[PDB]
Write a protein that binds this ligand. Structure first.
Ligand SMILES: CCCCCCCCCCCCCCCCCC(=O)OC[C@H](COP(=O)([O-])OCC(O)COP(=O)([O-])OC[C@@H](COC(=O)CCCCCCCCCCCCCCCCC)OC(=O)CCCCCCCCCCCCCCCCC)OC(=O)CCCCCCCCCCCCCCCCC
Ligand SMILES: CCCCCCCCCCCCCCCCCC(=O)OC[C@H](COP(=O)([O-])OCC(O)COP(=O)([O-])OC[C@@H](COC(=O)CCCCCCCCCCCCCCCCC)OC(=O)CCCCCCCCCCCCCCCCC)OC(=O)CCCCCCCCCCCCCCCCC
Ligand SMILES: CCCCCCCCCCCCCCCCCC(=O)OC[C@H](COP(=O)([O-])OCC(O)COP(=O)([O-])OC[C@@H](COC(=O)CCCCCCCCCCCCCCCCC)OC(=O)CCCCCCCCCCCCCCCCC)OC(=O)CCCCCCCCCCCCCCCCC
Ligand SMILES: CCCCCCCCCCCCCCCCC[C@@H](O)O[C@H](CO[C@H](O)CCCCCCCCCCCCCCC)COP(=O)(O)OCC[N+](C)(C)C
Ligand SMILES: CCCCCCCC/C=C\CCCCCCCC(=O)OC[C@H](COP(=O)(O)OCCN)OC(=O)CCCCCCC/C=C\CCCCCCCC
Ligand SMILES: CCCCCCCC/C=C\CCCCCCCC(=O)O[C@H](COC(=O)CCCCCCC/C=C/CCCCCCCC)COP(=O)(O)OCCN
Ligand SMILES: CCCCCCCC/C=C\CCCCCCCC(=O)O[C@H](COC(=O)CCCCCCC/C=C/CCCCCCCC)COP(=O)(O)OCCN
Ligand SMILES: CCCCCCCCCCCCCCCCCC(=O)OC[C@H](COP(=O)(O)OCCN)OC(=O)CCCCCCCCCCCCCCCCC
Ligand SMILES: CCCCCCCCCCCCCCCCCC(=O)OC[C@H](COP(=O)(O)OCCN)OC(=O)CCCCCCCCCCCCCCCCC
Ligand SMILES: Nc1ncnc2c1ncn2[C@@H]1O[C@H](COP(=O)(O)OP(=O)(O)O)[C@@H](O)[C@H]1O
Lengths: 99, 98, 320, 347, 54, 459
């Protein structure tokens, strides 16, 4: 041997001292409460509440607004015989091309 | 520029090349170091005396004073090195490496 | 203020502090001699401070509380085990020797600090310079290795080169048969396991190396058992050793300043006792080192600095 | 050395540097350099041993040669202008001589060998004073005469310094030589930015001085001069190793630590002057310095090396002397990146 | 079953005179622990003088 | 963003002031609370970004990445407390401090509105990661892995700093909004080519590009479980976010300069999948799978179409979740048998049934199984590549086949067959491990339910 070194310790099993262990801590009470807070907060609060919050987020992306605007535009343009999609994005009168 | 200035600058260059090229003795390099300041003294006084810079006449004296301080410092280091190694050879100053 | 360069500038001078009875006296002898009794008598009669032999746990006695620490935390070596199995396979013998050398070095620093800060002389039951005799005895009996001896010599060089040797060296000469008789009468089994060749090696080292070496430095007084029994004549012989050819007369105020600055700092004293020389005997693995250091930190009055340990009843920490 | 003599020699070194910094006359600047060297030699030789004597001899020879070349440059400038004031130099040859002399004083490559040799020769306190103060003076002179500096010569010596520092530090295993090569590289960075912004030169000088003071004081606290000596410090005071690791990360230039600020500002300033190849090469070459800083950090803090048996006694005892401003140097060298725009105050 | 930590082989690879040894650098040796080299046994060589007979 | 930034900097003192046995509980609970708070960033706009202040802004690209980072922190805490039982309290708190610092840097990285502040933070993420790897890794090779990771990233990113300061000098600003509104075409010149190279090479190294990827197996195999989780799930996505952001100023030069990188990405996607087929180590298999998926994301960014960016965003989020889960499963196996070899532990379905179910679900998501967001992103990238050229479909189909092959090979090797006879210490799965897998996998399927939340700004 080249050193005064400790032997490699045996692996510690959490189920030996505490058969009904959750794997969080050596102390039974701390282990139980760690399980409880993780399950409650994570699953209940974050999963359920965040999923329902995201489901009912207000329509700030303007999908339904854009659909209603498109319906108004289509109704007006087909009533008057105009093309449904304008051929140009901008006004050629406003655009000044080089000679 | 006159040829006198050329000769003095040449003497300084010769004394500088002498210092940078050690042979064995530390004393010889110290003598080369003292020659450089002698050439500096001569060049400075030639420049000052020609231009009649009256208040600058004291500058070569200060130059000599600090030449003396350098020579004293070098001789002190030389005696310490000789006490340690038995000779003033520069080959013995090899304990420290780059 | 504590001693420092400012105190030196202000005017604290060791030469002025000393009273010409400030002598370092070291008593030596083989295993189980009367050196302890003679040293106690010398310290008592001359008015000097006695320093018992620095074994294991001396550093424990000088720090924290005086109580010794666990052997796992202070020394990690056993004198009884060295007696039982001198040729162990875990390097116990050289671990013990190196730890005892470090302890003797620390005790010598303590004694020098006391003398320089007080002017009162000290009587050590053994010094740095007598420590190698057990190293030579171990080497000649095959207990330790040449590498162990070389490491010891390196550390001893770079450490003991820095201090002032004793003023007086008092050696008590006792023959090996008498040593064995006294050991047997004492009745301790571990020291009863000591072989006669080991005791002869220590005496050979003392007579051939230590005593001739200390004769050049200063004067050496040698006594037999009968002469050592009568300590009055020993003290009388000490009191009339007017000659002093050691470095102490050559010592000046600046040299004393340097020495006192050295000896008041215990971490600088032991700086070279831990050099990265990886002998299998003394080297300790990372995991064992971490575990033992954590345990020492968990000790009662050791987690913080001495004035800042709340679990031992230190108050006003928040304003300290 | 007597404490009074030591403090008067330290004050004389500082007085020579201050004379250099406050003088407006080339003769007075030369006098300041001479006074600094004269009082600096005994400081190197304070602890007498052959290595200290050799280091002092090499330092004296190099500095005397540099001072001689500097005085020659001064006299040549006086010949062609009749001016003693320190301003733009009127002769290109005198300017080249002055640049060579000041570079030799600073240790810029190819004038660098004395830096690792002397630093390994002298103690930790002497090396700290050497690096810090003896870089402080010539750089002030260079900043004063910056407007006449030849950019090609200055930048060549700066890039050489960066490369040489990186490579030497890669090879070294002694802490003092590591510090010396790191110093060479940092001087390279400062003098690279010098012909464009002396303000950035000053900023790099201050940050380098802070990091070097913290590093040297940590080494002095831990009493470690080699890699393996520093590998025992985790078993005595694990806090010092952690602070040293953070300081080493800062020195390597990793964001968001204070070592990133000088490199960042210098790269930006040189880019403003249409320099791209030089900043890119300088930034890439600093990876060598970071590599040997990280090699040092593995041994001391991120891994646990074997210890010895007398470390137990060392545990029992306590460190007595208190380093002055060590916590402040640790904090300033790692956590002042959000305070970057104070370089305008530095301006 | 535990984290690996450096051993004597690792430490000794880090404890040479220099990293990356060559022939010359392997002939080199690491400096002393206290930076004090052992004294060299130089010869004083006092001058020897014949004082007399003439 | 301060309502999310300050609670992290308050996780720090809470971690250092809590009791010795409450550190894990406190850190986990308050990380979950901060994740819940960060869920409010998903309410984005259709026109522009959420410009909180002069320093921070959020977008449809930043918001899912922030949510993923904040959600990943408590999972890393759970795995860490699994493997750090015997540590001292101070070192446990230091580990939690490194994790919290990494999360804070990542948050400010995704929300930084300037390219230079983004650079500072995205380089600041290196220090906690390097410390975690080289300090709390198990094997000898953690040191070399840390060196490789650090120097690859820095060699990539230093020319990026030079290019960024050059662009600031040229245009007056590094603000993302200003450089978007004031962008000009990049003319075909050598100077522009090297500017393009500086930027893209920084992020390609961070991605990694095939051929610049060796640091990834080195670091991901040798890091501890939390290090592996954050390296794969989030730190690989700094490259994608940066490449998406910085390509505003690189057009039209991206049309001509993307050929070498597209070729490297497609062929290296094939090559890394084939490597996965023949790996004797489980962690290396997961790492090379990460490389293949990031190659697909690089292809998407380089072809640079509205359909490719949406696929890239979806694939980045999905890969983060899936790779983190796979690393956690492998780590549970390792904590049983203390070896990373894949054929050592077999029959784990007949020894641990619920873990076999978790393995099945993670491997079903790793290969693109519809309608998972993994498949959604992969399919959008494949469609955009098909519009780019019609042989990209050949390469993409080969990659999908090999991906299914190696995923099911890993599942069959570890879980099926007969158990190793002499491994008699396979204790029943812990509630902590089961909950970790559930918390990895349920958000993925919910994201399948609502997919517009991870399709990026181009949606
Ligand atoms: C009357 C005139 C005024 C006198 C004022 C009192 C000074 C004298 C006091 C005294 O007697 O001290 C004894 C003491 C000598 O006693 P000693 O026992 O022989 O010395 C033991 C060693 O010092 C043992 O070594 P050490 O480990 O103790 O090292 C001591 C010291 C040795 O190092 C130094 O003294 C370094 C000097 C400065 C280095 C560069 C600093 C930064 C410069 C750039 C700043 C840019 C802005 O290094 C440090 O303390 C390092 C940290 C302090 C510097 C931090 C600077 C931050 C700015 O003298 C000194 O310490 C000299 C101080 C001189 C100060 C002059 C300027 C004021
Ligand atoms: C505020 C919380 C922290 C936030 C940090 C953010 C950044 C701040 C930087 C500066 C922080 C201040 C300085 C702290 C120094 C602490 C040193 C120490 O002894 O620590 C242990 C010490 C307790 O242990 P101990 O009893 O001293 O025993 C020590 C033995 O070593 C125990 O024996 P042992 O053997 O078990 O211990 C060995 C251990 C002992 O080692 C240590 O303890 C060393 C710790 C690191 C050194 C300090 C580095 C400073 C430079 C800046 C970077 C710091 C980042 C990490 C900060 C860690 C803070 C502890 O060493 C190791 O295990 C080696 C590990 C090597 C790798 C890790 C170390 C380096 C980490 C840093 C590098 C990464 C930086 C990334 C870049 C970004 C930076 C922001 O911890 C503390 O005292 C905690 C400090 C904070 C207390 C709370 C303060 C706030 C109170 C409430 C405020 C409320 C405000 C109002 C709110 C509104 C409602 C009212
Ligand atoms: C559902 C969760 C699935 C994943 C976790 C599975 C956990 C587990 O171990 O389960 C077995 C376990 C049964 O006990 P055991 O048999 O003793 O377990 C031992 C072994 O594990 C027994 O192992 P095993 O072999 O019996 O495992 C059975 C199962 C376990 O594994 C699974 O269930 C995994 C299933 C997903 C596979 C991976 C993803 C594939 C891509 C699809 C992703 C999107 C899906 C749709 C959206 C989902 C949104 C949540 O695996 C399979 O059956 C293989 C499925 C292969 C794929 C099928 C074809 C692909 C999908 C095609 C349709 C896609 C949907 C769109 C259709 C479009 C047209 C409508 O389940 C439970 O005990 C369930 C209780 C816990 C969960 C429920 C808690 C109660 C609350 C429910 C309502 C919540 C909302 C609030 C209501 C308030 C009023
Ligand atoms: C025993 C079990 C057997 C198997 C049973 C499960 C398998 C069946 C799955 C198929 C049934 C699905 C049920 C669908 C019910 C309808 C609800 C769903 O459709 O709503 C979704 C809503 O989306 C969901 O909320 C998905 C939320 C995504 C998860 C949010 C994050 C949760 C926190 C965790 C953080 C993880 C971060 C990861 C990176 C972001 C989709 O949007 P939408 O239908 O139109 O909303 C309706 C409300 N409106 C009308 C007002 C608009
Ligand atoms: C060995 C050969 C090395 C080849 C690879 C290059 C890496 C070494 C860096 C050395 C510099 C390379 C030359 C850089 C080009 C350059 O300097 O100019 C580019 C251009 C010209 O500027 P102006 O002077 O204003 O021109 C105006 C014309 N009227 O400036 C810029 O656009 C800024 C560009 C920053 C330079 C970035 C360097 C390019 C290197 C590519 C990065 C790839 C490295 C990634 C590493 C990945 C491995 C981990
Ligand atoms: C802490 C001491 C004071 C600090 C001063 C504040 C810092 C300023 C820098 C130092 C300046 C010192 C002043 C000395 C310069 C005097 C120059 C001068 O004015 O000339 C004389 C000054 O008068 C004197 O005689 C002064 C004599 C002083 C002698 C004693 C000085 C003490 C020096 C102590 C040595 C300390 C070593 C310093 C370190 C080296 C230098 C850095 C006046 O001549 P006049 O003929 O009147 O000119 C008008 C013409 N009709
Ligand atoms: C629909 C949503 C409504 C949900 C409301 C939830 C509010 C909190 C309810 C759950 C809290 C759990 C504990 C409740 C009361 C404690 C019960 C008890 O007495 O047991 C304690 C429980 O102790 C704990 O485990 C600590 C957990 C309780 C404190 C942590 C919850 C604090 C969270 C604050 C939420 C506010 C955040 C809002 C701002 C958002 C920030 C981003 C003792 O256990 P130990 O200390 O582990 O035993 C060892 C002693 N020898
Ligand atoms: C103008 C000079 C500035 C620097 C002076 C530094 C002097 C002290 C140097 C030693 C190291 C720091 C002190 C550590 C504790 C020392 C032992 C102790 O118990 O000290 C008690 C002391 C009490 O303070 P006290 O001395 O009464 O204050 C001055 C009164 N005239 O406790 C203290 O003094 C502790 C607080 C010290 C002051 C904070 C540290 C410096 C702050 C600098 C602010 C600017 C930031 C940039 C600094 C750049 C570097 C200087
Ligand atoms: C021993 C040496 C080993 C070297 C290994 C190199 C591996 C091969 C890398 C590239 C593989 C695909 C090559 C594709 C190619 O040649 O693209 C040329 C491309 C288009 O140019 P061109 O066709 O002329 O367009 C003009 C308009 N018609 O031209 C361009 O797009 C312009 C140049 C772009 C490339 C600049 C440099 C970057 C190279 C790719 C990344 C390098 C790093 C990663 C590679 C692995 C490294 C280990
Ligand atoms: N350096 C050393 N190595 C090994 N053993 C030592 C060393 N120094 C002292 N000892 C042991 O310590 C004990 C001290 O006994 P000692 O004081 O000599 O007896 P006494 O008090 O009768 O003189 C002895 O048994 C001796 O073996």
């Amino acid at each position: 041997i080249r050193l005064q070194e400790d032997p490699d310790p045996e692996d510690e099993n959490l189920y030996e001292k505490n058969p009904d262990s959750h794997g969080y801590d050596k102390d039974p009470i701390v282990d139980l409460w760690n399980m409880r807070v993780v399950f409650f907060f994570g699953f209940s609060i974050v999963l359920v509440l965040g999923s329902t919050f995201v489901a009912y987020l207000p329509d700030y992306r303007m999908q339904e607004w854009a659909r209603r605007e498109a319906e108004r535009l289509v109704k007006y343009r087909e009533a008057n015989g105009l093309p449904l999609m304008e051929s140009n994005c901008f006004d050629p009168n406003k655009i000044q091309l080089p000679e | 520029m006159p040829l006198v200035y050329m000769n003095i600058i040449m003497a300084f260059a010769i004394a500088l090349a002498g210092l940078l090229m050690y042979r064995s003795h530390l004393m010889s390099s110290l003598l080369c170091l003292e020659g450089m300041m002698l050439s500096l003294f001569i060049m400075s006084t030639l420049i000052i005396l020609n231009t009649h810079f009256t208040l600058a006449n004291m500058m070569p004296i200060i130059l000599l004073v600090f030449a003396a301080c350098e020579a004293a410092l070098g001789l002190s280091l030389l005696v310490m090195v000789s006490n340690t190694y038995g000779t003033d050879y520069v080959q013995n100053l090899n304990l420290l490496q780059c | 203020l504590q001693y420092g360069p400012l105190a030196f500038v202000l005017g604290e001078r060791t030469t002025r502090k000393l009273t010409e009875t400030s002598k370092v006296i070291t008593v030596d002898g083989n295993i189980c001699s009367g050196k302890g009794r003679l040293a106690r008598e010398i310290a008592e009669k001359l008015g000097l401070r006695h320093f018992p032999e620095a074994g294991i746990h001396y550093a424990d006695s000088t720090t924290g509380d005086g109580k010794p620490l666990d052997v796992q935390l202070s020394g990690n070596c056993s004198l009884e085990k060295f007696y039982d199995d001198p040729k162990s396979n875990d390097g116990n013998s050289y671990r013990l020797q190196s730890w005892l050398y470090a302890s003797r070095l620390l005790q010598y620093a303590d004694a020098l600090e006391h003398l320089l800060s007080t002017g009162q002389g000290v009587v050590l039951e053994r010094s740095i310079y007598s420590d190698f005799v057990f190293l030579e005895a171990m080497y000649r009996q095959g207990f330790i290795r040449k590498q162990c001896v070389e490491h010891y010599n390196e550390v001893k060089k770079v450490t003991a080169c820095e201090y002032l040797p004793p003023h007086v060296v008092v050696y008590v000469d006792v023959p090996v048969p008498e040593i064995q008789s006294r050991i047997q009468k004492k009745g301790n089994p571990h020291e009863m396991k000591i072989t006669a060749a080991y005791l002869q090696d220590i005496e050979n080292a003392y007579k051939k190396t230590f005593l001739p070496e200390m004769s050049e430095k200063c004067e050496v007084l040698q006594y037999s058992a009968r002469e050592a029994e009568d300590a009055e004549k020993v003290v009388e012989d000490i009191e009339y050793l007017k000659c002093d050819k050691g470095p102490w007369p050559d010592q000046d105020d600046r040299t004393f300043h340097r020495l006192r600055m050295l000896v008041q700092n215990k971490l600088e004293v032991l700086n070279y006792t831990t050099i990265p020389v990886y002998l299998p005997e003394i080297t300790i693995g990372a995991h064992q080192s971490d575990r033992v250091f954590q345990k020492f930190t968990e000790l009662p009055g050791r987690k913080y600095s001495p004035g800042y340990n709340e679990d031992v009843g230190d108050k006003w920490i928040w304003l300290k | 050395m007597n404490p009074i003599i030591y403090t008067t020699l330290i004050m004389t070194v500082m007085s020579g540097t201050m004379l250099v910094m406050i003088s407006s006359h080339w003769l007075l600047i030369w006098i300041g350099f001479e006074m600094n060297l004269l009082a600096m030699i005994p400081v190197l030789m304070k602890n007498f041993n052959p290595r200290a004597t050799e280091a002092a001899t090499k330092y004296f020879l190099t500095q005397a040669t540099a001072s001689m070349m500097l005085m020659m440059a001064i006299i040549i400038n006086l010949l062609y202008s009749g001016q003693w004031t320190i301003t733009k130099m009127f002769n290109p040859v005198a300017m080249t001589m002055m640049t060579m002399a000041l570079a030799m004083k600073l240790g810029l490559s190819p004038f660098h060998f004395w830096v690792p040799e002397v630093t390994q020769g002298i103690s930790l306190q002497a090396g700290l004073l050497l690096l810090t103060w003896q870089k402080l003076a010539p750089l002030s002179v260079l900043c004063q005469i910056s407007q006449s500096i030849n950019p090609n010569l200055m930048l060549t010596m700066a890039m050489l310094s960066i490369l040489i520092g990186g490579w030497g530090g890669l090879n070294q295993t002694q802490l003092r030589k590591i510090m010396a090569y790191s110093s060479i590289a940092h001087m390279g960075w400062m003098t690279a930015v010098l012909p464009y912004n002396t303000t950035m030169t000053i900023l790099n000088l201050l940050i380098y001085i802070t990091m070097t003071l913290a590093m040297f004081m940590l080494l002095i606290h831990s009493s470690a001069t080699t890699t393996l000596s520093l590998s025992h410090t985790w078993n005595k005071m694990p806090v010092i190793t952690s602070l040293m690791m953070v300081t080493l990360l800062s020195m390597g230039g990793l964001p968001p630590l204070s070592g990133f600020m000088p490199k960042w500002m210098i790269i930006q300033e040189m880019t403003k002057n249409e320099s791209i190849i030089m900043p890119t090469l300088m930034a890439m070459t600093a990876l060598l310095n970071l590599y040997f800083y990280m090699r040092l950090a593995y041994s001391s803090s991120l891994t646990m090396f074997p210890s010895t048996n007398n470390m137990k006694m060392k545990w029992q005892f306590e460190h007595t002397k208190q380093m002055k401003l060590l916590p402040t140097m640790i904090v300033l060298s790692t956590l002042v990146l959000p305070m970057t725009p104070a370089l305008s105050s530095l301006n | 079953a535990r984290q690996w930590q450096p051993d004597v082989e690792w430490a000794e690879q880090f404890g040479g005179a220099v990293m990356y040894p060559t022939k010359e650098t392997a002939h080199w040796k690491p400096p002393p622990w206290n930076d004090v080299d052992p004294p060299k046994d130089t010869l004083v060589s006092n001058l020897t003088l014949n004082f007399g007979p003439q | 963003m301060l309502k999310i930034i300050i609670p992290t900097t308050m996780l720090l003192p809470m971690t250092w002031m809590s009791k010795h046995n409450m550190i894990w509980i406190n850190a986990t609970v308050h990380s979950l609370l901060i994740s819940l708070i960060s869920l409010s960033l998903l309410n984005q706009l259709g026109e522009n970004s959420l410009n909180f202040s002069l320093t921070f802004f959020s977008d449809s690209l930043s918001a899912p990445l922030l949510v993923l980072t904040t959600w990943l922190l408590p999972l890393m805490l759970m795995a860490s407390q699994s493997h750090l039982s015997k540590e001292t309290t101070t070192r446990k708190k230091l580990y939690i401090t490194m994790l919290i610092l990494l999360q804070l840097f990542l948050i400010m990285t995704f929300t930084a509105t300037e390219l230079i502040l983004f650079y500072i933070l995205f380089e600041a993420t290196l220090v906690p990661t390097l410390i975690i790897i080289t300090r709390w890794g198990n094997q000898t090779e953690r040191l070399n892995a840390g060196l490789y990771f650090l120097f690859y990233t820095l060699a990539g990113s230093l020319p990026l700093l030079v290019a960024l300061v050059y662009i600031q000098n040229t245009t007056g600003s590094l603000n993302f909004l200003i450089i978007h509104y004031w962008s000009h075409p990049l003319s075909n010149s050598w100077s522009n080519i090297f500017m393009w190279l500086a930027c893209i090479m920084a992020f390609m190294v961070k991605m990694p590009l095939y051929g610049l990827h060796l640091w990834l197996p080195k670091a991901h195999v040798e890091a501890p479980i939390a290090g592996s989780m954050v390296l794969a799930a989030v730190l690989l996505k700094l490259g994608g976010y940066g490449m998406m952001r910085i390509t505003t100023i690189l057009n039209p030069l991206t049309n001509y300069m993307a050929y070498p990188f597209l070729m490297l990405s497609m062929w290296g996607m094939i090559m890394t999948s084939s490597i996965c087929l023949r790996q004797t180590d489980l962690k290396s298999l997961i790492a090379y799978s990460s490389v293949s998926h990031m190659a697909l994301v690089i292809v998407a960014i380089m072809i640079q179409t509205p359909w490719s960016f949406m696929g890239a965003t979806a694939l980045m989020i999905a890969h983060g979740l899936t790779s983190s889960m796979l690393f956690c499963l492998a780590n549970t196996n390792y904590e049983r048998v203390h070896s990373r070899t894949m054929i050592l532990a077999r029959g784990l379905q007949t020894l641990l049934p619920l873990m076999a179910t978790w393995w099945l679900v993670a491997s079903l998501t790793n290969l693109a199984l519809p309608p998972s967001i993994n498949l959604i992103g992969e399919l959008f990238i494949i469609t955009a590549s098909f519009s780019w050229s019609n042989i990209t479909i050949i390469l993409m189909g080969m990659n999908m086949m090999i991906t299914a092959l190696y995923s099911l090979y890993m599942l069959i090797t570890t879980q099926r067959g007969k158990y190793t006879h002499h491994i008699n210490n396979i204790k029943p799965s812990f509630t902590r491990e089961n909950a970790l897998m559930a918390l990895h996998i349920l958000p993925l399927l919910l994201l399948t339910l609502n997919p517009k939340m991870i399709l990026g700004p181009l949606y």
